[PDB]
Ligand binder design. Sequence first.
Ligand SMILES: Nc1ncnc2c1ncn2[C@@H]1O[C@H](COP(=O)(O)OP(=O)(O)O)[C@@H](O)[C@H]1O
Length: 216
Amino acid sequence: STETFAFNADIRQLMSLIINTFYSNKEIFLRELISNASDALDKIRYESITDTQKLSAEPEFFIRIIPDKTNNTLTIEDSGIGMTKNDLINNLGTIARSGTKAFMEAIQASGDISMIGQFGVGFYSAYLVADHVVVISKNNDDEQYVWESAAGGSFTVTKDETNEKLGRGTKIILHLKEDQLEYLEEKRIKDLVKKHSEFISFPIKLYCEHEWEELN
Ligand SMILES: Nc1ncnc2c1ncn2[C@@H]1O[C@H](COP(=O)(O)OP(=O)(O)O)[C@@H](O)[C@H]1O
């Protein structure tokens, strides 16, 4: 059954800024999410080098990008370390980190919205292009859970019993805004990924039409 959580106030203000901004460089969400996937993969590769068993639920490292024109969603999937239920609650809303508070104080003092691009807003950049965001995650030390938020001051976390099992990793599902459908186009995606992927040392694949295309 679903549990509801309140966004930390600072995180709520960050989301508020993101949702109301006219910042035109929205495409940066893609680099933020792919970097997150790379970091999560970093972690499971690191943990498993001295302990190969940690790879058993999913032996291959990958990042997959799946645009879906039928329901206007863009999905970023990885087989990284994944998040436990507590991880989703702790890392995706309830706790405002040092950097986040510093970013908010800085941007409020300067009003310089180019900071969004210069310093980044991490995972929350998804709300630059999406109305609603879903996160399915599976970590070795817990069952599969689902995090959801339409950015209304709250999010929910629900033990997953409807979706296909990931084995290990994370699936970020962006429900794109009506005016942001360009990010379903494969050329748009490839050009963005090419721009930010030189030093991502995991295989990146794009779902095309259907077949998987290698981006690196
Ligand atoms: N794809 C992912 N797999 C596993 N954990 C993730 C993923 N994306 C985000 N997280 C967790 O959410 C946290 C917050 O993400 P973010 O706001 O991008 O900050 P940062 O990238 O600086 O960690 C990350 O530190 C990470 O712990």
